[PDB]
Write a protein that binds this DNA or RNA. Structure first.
Ligand SMILES: [Zn+2]
Ligand SMILES: [Zn+2]
Length: 67
DNA sequence: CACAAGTGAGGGATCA
DNA sequence: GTGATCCCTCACTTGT
């Protein structure tokens, strides 16, 4: 099973389908300090661990890897 | 501005 | 549709 966007093959349609969901680029998780939007909750909780290290943290919006 | 190295966000996996 | 986790990537970032 492959995708018409990347051509990346997937051994199961269950995880190919969650890959096509990554194409719409839904960023529903936002940091309540620097306003940066995230695709996963785990990406947000890992991000605050660095907000405790440094005081002045503000990254630029990074690009998603697949369109 | 190339270049290396350190950085952290994106995205793949199994599973409840 | 979640999401949690383990982890490897790779674009930014920094320094030379
Ligand atoms: Zn795809
Ligand atoms: Zn933040």
């Amino acid at each position: 099973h492959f995708c018409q966007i990347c051509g990346k093959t997937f051994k199961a349609v269950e995880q190919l389908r969650v890959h096509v969901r990554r194409h719409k680029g839904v960023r529903k998780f936002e940091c309540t300090e620097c306003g940066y939007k995230f695709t996963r909750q785990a990406h947000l909780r890992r991000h605050m661990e660095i907000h405790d290290r440094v005081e002045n943290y503000n990254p630029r919006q990074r690009k998603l890897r697949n369109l």
